[PDB]
Structures are given as structure tokens and as C-alpha cells.
Symmetry: T
Subunit: 150 residues, 12 copies
Amino acid sequence: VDTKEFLNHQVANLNVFTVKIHQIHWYMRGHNFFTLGEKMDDLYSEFGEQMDEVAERLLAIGGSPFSTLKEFLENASVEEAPYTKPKTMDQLMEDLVGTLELLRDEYKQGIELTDKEGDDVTNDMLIAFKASIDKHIWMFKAFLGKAPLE
Amino acid sequence: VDTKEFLNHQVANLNVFTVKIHQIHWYMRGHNFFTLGEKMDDLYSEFGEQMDEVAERLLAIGGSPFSTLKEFLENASVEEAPYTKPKTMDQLMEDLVGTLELLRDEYKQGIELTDKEGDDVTNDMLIAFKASIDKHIWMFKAFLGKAPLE
Amino acid sequence: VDTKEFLNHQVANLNVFTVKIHQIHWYMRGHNFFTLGEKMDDLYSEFGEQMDEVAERLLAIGGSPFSTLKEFLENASVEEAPYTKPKTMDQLMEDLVGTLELLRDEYKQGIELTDKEGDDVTNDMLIAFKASIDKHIWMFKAFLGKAPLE
Amino acid sequence: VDTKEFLNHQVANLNVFTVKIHQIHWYMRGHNFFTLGEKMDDLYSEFGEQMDEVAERLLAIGGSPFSTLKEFLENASVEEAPYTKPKTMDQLMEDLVGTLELLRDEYKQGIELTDKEGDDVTNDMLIAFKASIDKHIWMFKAFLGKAPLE
Amino acid sequence: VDTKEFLNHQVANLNVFTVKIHQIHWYMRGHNFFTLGEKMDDLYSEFGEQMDEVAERLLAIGGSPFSTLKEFLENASVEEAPYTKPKTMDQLMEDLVGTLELLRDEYKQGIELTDKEGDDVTNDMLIAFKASIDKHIWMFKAFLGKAPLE
Amino acid sequence: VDTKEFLNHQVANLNVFTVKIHQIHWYMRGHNFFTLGEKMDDLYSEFGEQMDEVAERLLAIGGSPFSTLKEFLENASVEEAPYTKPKTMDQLMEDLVGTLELLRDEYKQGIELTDKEGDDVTNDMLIAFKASIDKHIWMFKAFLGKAPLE
Amino acid sequence: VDTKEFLNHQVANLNVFTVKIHQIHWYMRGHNFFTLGEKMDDLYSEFGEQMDEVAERLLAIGGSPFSTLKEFLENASVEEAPYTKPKTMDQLMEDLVGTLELLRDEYKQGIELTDKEGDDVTNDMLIAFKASIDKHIWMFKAFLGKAPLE
Amino acid sequence: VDTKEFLNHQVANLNVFTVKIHQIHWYMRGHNFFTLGEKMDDLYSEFGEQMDEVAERLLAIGGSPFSTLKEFLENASVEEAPYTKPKTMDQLMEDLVGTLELLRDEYKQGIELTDKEGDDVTNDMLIAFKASIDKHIWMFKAFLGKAPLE
Amino acid sequence: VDTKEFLNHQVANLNVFTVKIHQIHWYMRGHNFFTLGEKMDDLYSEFGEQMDEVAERLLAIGGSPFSTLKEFLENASVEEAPYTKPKTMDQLMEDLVGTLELLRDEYKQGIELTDKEGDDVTNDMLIAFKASIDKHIWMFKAFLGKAPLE
Amino acid sequence: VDTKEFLNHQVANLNVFTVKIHQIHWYMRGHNFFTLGEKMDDLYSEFGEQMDEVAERLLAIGGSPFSTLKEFLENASVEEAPYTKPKTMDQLMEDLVGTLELLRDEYKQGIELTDKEGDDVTNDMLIAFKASIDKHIWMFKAFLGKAPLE
Amino acid sequence: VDTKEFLNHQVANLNVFTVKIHQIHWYMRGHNFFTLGEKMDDLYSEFGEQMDEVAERLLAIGGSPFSTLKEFLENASVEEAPYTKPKTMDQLMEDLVGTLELLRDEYKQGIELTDKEGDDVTNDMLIAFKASIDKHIWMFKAFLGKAPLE
Amino acid sequence: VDTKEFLNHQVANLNVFTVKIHQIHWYMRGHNFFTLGEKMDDLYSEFGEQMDEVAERLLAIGGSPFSTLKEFLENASVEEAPYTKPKTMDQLMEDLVGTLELLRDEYKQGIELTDKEGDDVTNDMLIAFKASIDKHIWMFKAFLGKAPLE
């Protein structure tokens, strides 16, 4: 793709992801409601901050970020669904994990692309984000009784 | 509309508005960039917390929060548009203020509803949010040379 | 009941509830001991804070707060029992919830009585507390796997 | 006399009360000098914050706050007098308490008036102020060896 | 006796003391209202933490803490009475100092017992509270114009 | 005028100035509403503290500070006027600067006078106040597009 | 054994325990991953401070602390095994708990030895550590659904 | 004298004053025990820092500070006496005030001497300490029911 | 031409740039004085920090940083000139943005150079600084009414 | 070697280094006792943190950290030796510097290996650790009277 | 002797020591001036807390503290000498170590005295102080290159 | 030379001195690397503040500060030389002391000139700076084994 198009795509993804995290926090039940609820507050903030960093970096290389729900929905590859059928804590975490893995695999594409375009700053930004995602993956997989790449 | 429906309606509104605040921040230019930039981060957080409290209050009365972009679009009275043709710092603050006014008047309806249904907590919450909106309306109107209600 | 009596009745209830929260903390066992332990410490502080405000509000409208364990036992509707034969972490939490639901329903009576008697301050006080009690019933019921209003 | 004129009247009162808090602080003698001097500091700040929130609230409903000593003098119901004759600390705390009594009764009038006008925010602001005043009235009455309403 | 019984006996005493500290706070009147009320707040926190630590130590050695108002009244040697007739500040302080004296002396008894049973931790815990108590006795008797042990 | 008369005179001035700072905060409009609003909050509290220090120093030399709005008005050389026509942000800043220059020039008189009377503490205090005033003059003249002394 | 060799034996014990706490943190899985993860960070820090204090007290009486993995291994009574077979959260905490039990019983012997030698400072340091170990034992055992001394 | 001997003379005085502040704090009795206790801690700290500053200034200008109790006693104009007969708070507070007046009056001599000799740093340091001493004379005189100078 | 040469060149540049940030703070006039003035304080610290990190990195790889104004002047590519002719706020910020662009482009060279010599640490330090520079180029261009890559 | 075995090898090395830092601190003597003690506290904490991140990163890529003293000693290239004979400050710090140099050199191989395997995140973690190591070698060598590569 | 006289005796010792720590600070010269003057500032404060605690414990047991320089000189075994002949940093430190050693050995006597009197609180305090004294003896002897007990 | 030219001359000096403090920090070797390194940090920010205060004061009396390297070099009396051949810590500290002595002597000319011109603010600021310089001169002179004035 190009670097601008990549970052914008992640602007949309991250605004979908952030609303999903609220969905999980609002609808979760079970013995881990307090501990996992506060984990989702923290996740909400961090993913809000990555989103800002992506948008502001795109601004800084001369692009124009998506800035409506309509545009996020039209461009996100991260998926959402309304909450209807009760979902277990394990199933919410599995959804969360699925999304983190999706962002991990797309950032890895952004990392390669951005090395080929010689955009050293955006490259480095995306790698620091992947470092945090990879650590979240291990922890939530561990919560689900699984190994990180299982 | 009953109390549950009012509140969910505001959950959607606030998510549209929050994303709007980011639009104003991302795309603002001119001599006031720095000082309205900081004010927009402040508004982003304040309305983010408002949206959280509205959702948790709805949860606490037996209701089910809207929790996806598509649901927020389907139900929001707050309007958004993509940023296409440049806009002045004044033009952006006027959309901001125009959206604040919308929320003020709709919170006023929620306050009356909620008082007739005898829901004293939701009533109190809505008032304190209004006190803040009234103050922001006075301040951003002063920024544009105008009296609050004028 | 007049406002002074209603306020004094809650001084009693809250000094009983306060001791009950320590009972739960001290005796609780099972996989949720740490997170529920910290949550009991927060509830303890918070409800002793309420109690203090209740008594101070009673003092300021010219009343005389109960001020002995015996007076609290004589006047409370919140019940206690000594801990004898083990109960599980669901059983202690259901007892907790039951008591929050009693303080909510009684606070609602106090709200109405206080409105009728034109005491705006005590009214506002009580409503603010019910906001917090309502939040706690939602949260603690989500922990138990159930909806807020059961 | 409507909400705007009531708020404006309190701007004048609170500026007179504030300067009377300095007069007491400056002229006090006796064994309680240090602990009541510190009390007057806290009261000076607290009452300077009410004044600000009152003037900001009047601005937010479209009014114009009095903004000169001359204007506070033409309009205040709170009385002041030059410090010609030394007084005991008890007599100074009687004058203090008599002014808090005046402000409580006046805010009561504004509370009823602002409920009749459906100004929910100004109403709620004034109740919160009345709660703090009633607490100070209990305390300074206790300092003087009397009950709150006496 | 034995150590566990002695600790439980103090769980009951400290809960009664703590309610008595509140009693003195709520009802005191006279020139020392502010400083002494402040001090009662400090004593209230300090003795409540003393009580948790007594209860947790009891838990740590296989005990079962008293955990009701009923059980505290049945086992406490600390005496409580309802407030009816007005009391001086001095008279309230003489009650406070006499209760502090009674806990000191039961603690010395407890320190000797726990020495003989070889419970080093519980012995150390009790020596440290007697340090604080002894300090409070000197300080409050000084407030009353008296030596610490006259 | 001797040292005590001079200090008393500035107690009156500073109470007038402090109210003028509020008038400027409350009635200000235009693009610098936010940044200038915070500057008057800082000025308000700085000049309140100058006033407290002037008064306490008048006390410490055997003086008796003016302590009513009536005395402040009767003795102050600083002028006030009711807010009747809306003013420019520039015009309001010219009234601020104009008042700062008056205080600067008068303090210069107090500094010579107090040097002549050999009162070294009052001399020192007044010189530290002048330093801060001279800096406020540069900065606000700079804000107005001007050099400090033209 | 004299005091020196005892304290040195705990330098080695503590170095093995501390690496064991890391083993538990790194390999834990299941629903208590998040709550116990943070608990192991706290236990890691607390037991690393115990060891510093043990070594410094050994240095202050003229001893010479073990200072290699090799010597810690040759002298520790605490045992380690490499992680191979998967283990439950429950098995890991039982290892943790058994190991705390070992430390408690060895310190009880150091408290006797150290009293017989007349070394009052080391005795006191050892009693404080035992206090904290015993509290930890009650707590982790309660997480496991058992009483402290079972 | 000269500047070096003057500073050394005050090093001695301040060490005699600071032990007196402890004496007043240790022997004080009566209703003001708690509040005056706290002011004695603050004066001790403040007068201790003033001493270090005087001694380090003495060093900066090439002098050699008195550094023993024997030299302090041999050089100080400040008097001390052992505490034998009982003394009231007032009597304790009047020795405190008499001592500040002496330090004030000697600092005044040192100020004049330091002006003649051209030591502008020492001159300014002495003036700042007299500002605080003057303020303390005002406050403790006022605690005694007296004007600062008469 | 090698890593050491480049890093030293930037030590020279950053010391010229820093003094230019001061020239801008000291001479700026107009309505943005307060907000741009604070912005220069922050840039001043942040480029001083960068300079130290460049100096420390040169030192870490065996170099000898320039350490005199004479050396900075002879070696710098950033330009300076005495402030003589009046400059507009915009004109000063264009000079800033211009100097920022020069550093961005030079850092780009150092990034490719340090890639080819295999100095990964210096490479990564340079990438991090350019990220911050690119963002300030965006923000200041936006203050000027302009796209970042204009 | 792959990434996983490199990282595990450093888990081993970092647990040996950390214990050697303690050896240095505990056996420090001379004029440098306080300055070097402090610096060793800081280095212990830093290398402790470094270790956790190495372990956690290995966990995140599907590996299995060494987790016993036994495996650390079996796998480590960093050497240790018992303190059987007194050594100088200089010998202890030369050891420190040489161990730092080995870690730099091996991390340099890991940076090359992770680059070749396309592990962007690990590569970047390792480069930031080298930045700090290179800076500690400069500083600790400057302390010994030598240039960084001498 | 008895506990009261042993405590007074140390009130005199600590007062002599505190002044002595100041002498070391003030007259100290050479390469260790900064690294050791900071440690003298800590030792000053620390032995100031100790002296307070001794004095207040004496008061709490019915004693009457020495409270004049004269009384401290009459009663102390810690010796002081005026500074005339210059001294090595070595010499001043040796006199420091020698004085801490005296204090250690007199506290050892107080500990025994206080065990045989049954004063459990005073005993514990004296042990806590000797702990810190032992540490200081070791650290300062390490700084001089001696082992703690040669 | 007048007050303006003196102040501008010190803007030049302070910029050379601040860069000399960096030269000292960067090239220092030996046993005080860490402790003096940190003193150079404190000094760097302290004379940086002095410079800002001198420039802002010059601004506030209608002056125009030098604001380029070329101007500072042309005007300064403080000397600098490039770091070529190696220098001891003492030699570095003598260069530092010699420069502080120069500033002290020049500031004393500015103290006199500024007294003759009736500029009280600038006079007081310069005395405060001399007070700090004199303190530094004693401490660094003592480091070197010398008396302040020799």
C-alpha cells in the first residue's frame, strides 16, 4: 500500500477496537469482573493513546485522518458485533485476543512497508506498539490457559 | 421515551461527539492551535468520562448499552461530517458549541422525564453534566465574541 | 418518621454494615480472596465515610446521633450473625448484596420523606449515596453472574 | 426577584463576607489565635470559591455580575463595620456565625425560587453551598458552647 | 488465659473504643472543639488500624475474630454509655484517658502472657501499641493540667 | 505619610485591584479568553497574597489595617468603574497595566519613605513586590505589542 | 550454628525463593493470572528487601555474606526444580506456601538462637519478618480454601 | 564589634534558643497543649535552619563558627534556666516572646553594623530573619491577649 | 563523514538553536506572548536534553564533544543573527520552523550514515529525536496556518 | 542459536550479573563507599528490570525461561567467584566493567541475530539495553580514570 | 541506674552529639566534603529524631528531661572539643565512630537495665536505635577501610 | 557602565559559564565522577535560571539582551578554552572556582552601581545571586582543601 494509507487504516481499526473494549467491560460477568474490568480501563486508555499517536503521525507526514464513525466503519478490517447472546468471560477474552492478533499481523505489514518506503519514524512507532500487543497476547492467552502462539 | 431509552440515546450521542472533538483537534489551524488543542484534549476526556458514567448508570438500572459504531450511528441525534474543505478556528468552535447546545437541551428533556419517573439518581447525574455544559457554552461563546445564549 | 429519626436509623444500620464488611473480609476464602479482599477494604472506608456524613448531617439539623454499640443494635434493621460454620464466597457476597439492597430501599424512603419535609440538603446527600449503592449492586451482581435487578 | 438578581445579590454578599473573614483574622487575640486563624484561612478560600462559582453561574445564564466595591456596598444585605472597639474571640465568632445564619436563610430563599423557575443547576449549586454552611454553623456553635439552632 | 482469647478480647474492646472516640467527637463543645476534634479523627483511624492488626494476627495463628456488635458487647471490658446529660470537654477527655489507661493495663497483661507462651510476634505487636497508648496518655493528661501517672 | 499610613493605603488599593482583576476575568471575550483567564486567576491569588503580607506587616509594626469595603473605597487611589459597555480584550489589559504602573510608582514612594524611617523589613517586602510588578508590566505590555516603558 | 551462619543461611534461602517467585510469575496460567501476577511482583520486592536487610545486618556484626549462585545453591535448604511438567495454579501456590512455612520455622529457630546469644537487634529483625511471613501464610492458604495452620 | 563576631554571637544564641523551644514544648501543660506543641516543632525547625544559615554564612566570609555547648554557653546573650517550679502556658509563652524581642533587637544592631561594613549578603540575610521574628512576635503576643509592641 | 563527526556537528547546532529559542522568548510580542512563551520554555528544555544525549553518546563511542562557544560557532550549520529589526510573532516562528527543518534533514543524513556504519544505538537515538521534531514541525506549521510539508 | 536461545542465555547471564552487583556492594570499602553504594543500588534495580523484560519477551515469542539458580549457572557466560580473599575497590569495579563489556558484546550479536531473523521487537529491546550499557561503561570507566574504549 | 536517669543521661548525650555532627560538617575539608557532608545532614536529623523520642519516652514514664545546655554539659559522657588545630577528614570521622561506639555501649546497658525493670516499651525503642547505630558504625568504618569490629 | 550594560554583560558571562559547566561535566574523570557530576547538574540549572532572571530583568527596565553566541563571545569577561590536553578533577574545580570568584567580584560592582542608580529591584536580585555564589565558593574551596578566601 503506502504509509499514509496504512496509518489511516489503523485509525479506523483502533476506533473500532476501543469501542469493543468498552463492550467487553460493560457486558462482562463472573468472578473476574473486578480484576478484568480494571484491565479493560487500562487497555482502553493505551489503545486510545496509540490511536492518537497514529493520527498525529499521519498528520505529521502530510495525510488527513479519517474522523467520523461512518469513515471508521467503512475502512476498518477489525470486526464488531452488537451484544445479544450472553457471552462468557472466556469468550470475551478470546474475542479480545483475536483482535490483538489481527492488529499484530497488520502492524507487521506496516513495519515491512514502512522499512521499504524508508520512513524510519513510523517504522519505529509501529514496532513499539507491536511490543505492547505481543505482551498483551501472552498475558490474555495465559489467562485462557494457552501458550502465546497456540 | 423512558429513562433507559434516553440514556442509551445519550451513549450514542457522546460517542459521536467524542470523535467529533478529535476531528476538531486533528484539523485545527491558526494562532489558537496550541491553546484550543489543550482544551480539546480536556473535552475529549471529560466527555469520555460522561459517556462511561451514562453507560454504567444504564447498566445499573437493568438496561443494555449500545456498544458498536453501527449502533451509535443508527441512534445518534448528534451529526457528523467528514472533513473535506478547510474550516476556520471559529467555524470549528461553532460546530462544537452547536453540538454542546444540542446536548444541553436534550439533557434538559432527560431531566424532566427522569423526574416524572421518580429516578432521583439519573436525575442528579444529568443535572451535574448540564452544569458543566452550561459553563463550556459560556466559555466557548466568549472565545467567539458572543454572550452565552445569544 | 421525621428527618432526624430517619438519619439516626441509618447511623445504626451503617455501624452494623461496617462490622459486617470486616466479617466478610476476615473470613473469606477461595480463588477470589485477593480481589474481594481489596474490594472489602474500599467498601469499609467508603461506608464509614457515609456514616460520618450521616451523623454530621444529623448534628447540623439539631439532632443527637446514637453513639454506642448498644444504641446501634437497638435501632438497626440491618441484621448480623456471628460466623460459625463455613460459608462460600458466593454466600458472603449474596449477604453483602442483600444488605446493599436494604440500604437502597430505605434510602429511597428517606429521599421521599426528606422531599416532603423540605430538607433539601439531606435529600441531596441521600440521593448521592444511593447512586453509589446502586453502582455496587450492579458490580457485585455481575461478579455473581447475574443482572443488577436479579 | 428572579434567579439572575438573586445570584447577583450573593456576589455582593460574598465579597462583604470575605473581607469580614480577613477582619476577624487580622484582629483576633486570645488563646485560640492559631487554630481559629487557620480556620479563617480555610473559610476565606472556601467563600472566595463560592463567590467565583456564583459569578460564573450567573454569566452562564446570561447575567452580568456586580464588579466593584461600590456595587457590592449598594447591594449587600451582609453588614460590615470598621474595627474601632476591640472584641473578644467569642464576640467575633458570634458575628461570624450570625453572617453564616443570614447566608443560609438567604440561600434557602434562592433554593425555593430556583426550583420554582426550573433552574435545576443553580438549585443544585445552592443546596451544596447550604450544606457546607450548615456544617460550619454546627461547628462554630459548638466552639461557643451552644447547639446549632440554639 | 491464652493468646487467642486475649486477642479476641481486644477485638471487642477496640470496636467499642472506636465508637466512643466518635461519640466524644460528635458531642464535644467549647473553645477546644477544633483541635480536639482533629485529634479524635487521628485516634479514630489509629485505633481502627490497631483493631484490624489485632484481628489479622488472630487469623494468622488459627483464631476466629469476634465479628458482630453483639459479640463485641458480650466480651468488651471497655465501658460505653449513651450521651444524655451534657459533659465538659474535660469530662470527655477524662473518660478518653481512663479508657486509654484500661487498654494500656490489659495490654501489659497481654504482653506478659504472650512472653510466657512464646508467641514472639504477638508480644512485639502489643509492645508497639503500648508505646502509642503511653504517648497518648502523657499528651491528654498534659492537656488536662496533670502529670502522666498522677 | 509615615510607614503605617503608607501600608494601610496599599491594603485599600490591593482590595480594589483584586476586585478589578475579577471584573476583567468575568467580562472578557475574544480569542485569548482561555489563556488570559488563567493569567487573571494567577494574578488574583498573587495580589491577594501581597495584600495578606501588607496587612500582616502593618500589624507587626503596631498598625491597624483597614478592614471594610467602605474604608477601602474611602482610602484607595486605585480607581474602579462599573462594567456598562463591553470592552476589547486590549482595553481591559490597558486598565490592568495602568493599575500595575500606579502600584509600581506608589511602591517606589513607599520604598524611599521606609528607607528614610529606617524600617528595613517593610523596605524589603516592598522591593520584592515591585520586582514582580515590573515583570507583569513587561509581559502584559508585550502582549499588547508594546515595550515596557512606552 | 551461631547468628552469623544463620543469617548467611537465609541469604542463600532468600536468593533461591526470590528466583522461585519469578518461576511462578513466568509460568502461571489460568483465571487468577492477573491477580496472582501482581501478588508475585509484590512478594518478589518484599523478599528482595528482606535479603538486603539480612545481608546488611550480617555485615554489621562482622560476618561475610554468600555472594554467588554457586554458594547459594550449596547452602540453601529451600529447594528448586526446573519447570517441565505443566502445573496448576494451585500446585504452584502450594509450592509457594510450603516454602513460606519452611522460612517461618527456620526464622523461629533463628529467633531462639539469637535470643540465647543476647543479640537483641537481629532477634527484633527476625521477629518482624516472621510477622509478615505469617500474614502471608494465612492469606495464601485462604486463597487455597484452607485455614492457616492446617 | 564586627560582622564575624556578630554572626558567631548569634550561632551561640540560636543554639540556646532552640533547646529552650524544646524545654517549652516538653514542660507545657493546659488546654493549648496540642496547638502550641505544633508551633514549637515549627519554631524549632525554623530556628534550627536560621542557625545553619548563620553558621554557613560565617564560613563563607572566612570565619570559624562556635561548635560546642561550652562555647555556646560562654558567648550567648540569650538566657536559659532549668525547669523546676511549675509555670503556666502564659509564663512559658512570655519567655518565648521576651527571647524573640532580644533576637530582634540584636539583629537590628547586626543589620546596622553590616550596612556600615558593606556586607550586603549578610545584611539581607539578617533582614529576612527579622521579618519572620517580627511576624512571630505579632502572633504570640496576640495569643497572650496583647498588642505586638505594647 | 563518520558517526563522531556528525554527532559533534549536532552538538554545535543544538547549542546555537537553544540560544535562538531564548532570543525568540525574550523578544516576542503580540497576543500570543503567553502561550508561545511557555512553548519556548518547553522547547528550550527539550533541545537542551537532546544536546546532552548527543554529547553523552559521542562520549560513549570514544569521541570528544565541542565544549566552547567558539567551537560551536565555527562548526554549526544552524544560522543566527542579532535581533535588531522588529520581527512579527509569525516571522519568529518561521525562523524556528526553518531551523527545525534543517535539523530534521540533517538528522536524516545521520540516520543513513549510522545505518551504513552499523551503529544501532546512535541510529535509534537519531530516529527518536526526528519523531519529536516532525511533530513540532506539524504543530508550528499549523499555528502558522499551513500544512506540515508545505 | 536462534532468538529464543539467545534471550534465555541472557536470562541466565542477567541473574548472575545481578547477584555479582550485590557482591560488589556488600564488599565495597574505601572513600568511595557511599557514592558507589548508591550507584550499585541503581544498577541492581536496572538490571533486575532488564531481566524481567528479557524473560517476558521470551515468553511472548513461545519460549520457556530458565527459572532456577541451577540452570542459570549451567547456561551463563558471565563468570562469578566467591569472596574468599579481600579485593580492592578497583578490582571489584574492573570486574563490573569487564562484565558490562561482555554483555555489550553479546547483545551486539543478539542485535545482529534478531535483525537477520526479522524479529523487529526483540531487536529494538536489545538496542535500548545496549544504549544504557554503553553509557554505564563510559561513566564507570571515567570513574576509574580511563576513556570508554581504553 | 534506673530507667528514668538512663533516659535523661542520653538526652544529654544526644544534644552533645548533635552539635558535634554540625562541627564535623562545618569544618570538613578534602575530596569527601560533598559525599560526607550529605551523610552528616542525615545523621543530624536522625539523632535529632532519636533525642526527641528519648525525651518524650522519659516524659511518658513520669520523668523530667534535662532542658538546658548547662544541664546537658553537667550530665553527658559524650565529649566535645572546640575546633582550633586543623584535623584530617580521617580524624573527624574516627572521633565520630568513637562517639557512636560509646553510644552503642551505653544503649546496650540501657537495654539490660530496662529488661530487668520490665519496661517493655523503652527496651524496644533502645533496640531500634542500636540497630541504626550498629549500621552507621559499619558504614563509616567501611568508608575508613576498617572492618566493623577491629 | 550603567545598570543596562552591566546586566547585558552578565547575560554574556552566564552563557559562557553554563557551557563551561558542561565542559567540566563531560570531560571529568576520577573518584568524584558521580557526586561532582551531579553538582555540575545542579549548577547548570542554577546559573541557567540566573541567566533567565538577568535577561528578563533587563527586559523589564527597557533593555535589549544580547542573544547569539557571537554576541556573548564579543562581550563576555569569563574566559573559555577548548578541552585538549587532560585535566585533573582539582584543576577542573579550580577553573570553576576562579570563574565563580570573577562573577562574585563583578556582581559586587553591579551591587554598588545599582545602589547609586536607585534601582532597588536589580540591586536585591544581584545580592541574592552573590549569596549563592559565596556559598558555592566555600564548598568548592573546601573540596580542594582550602579556606574560602584563603
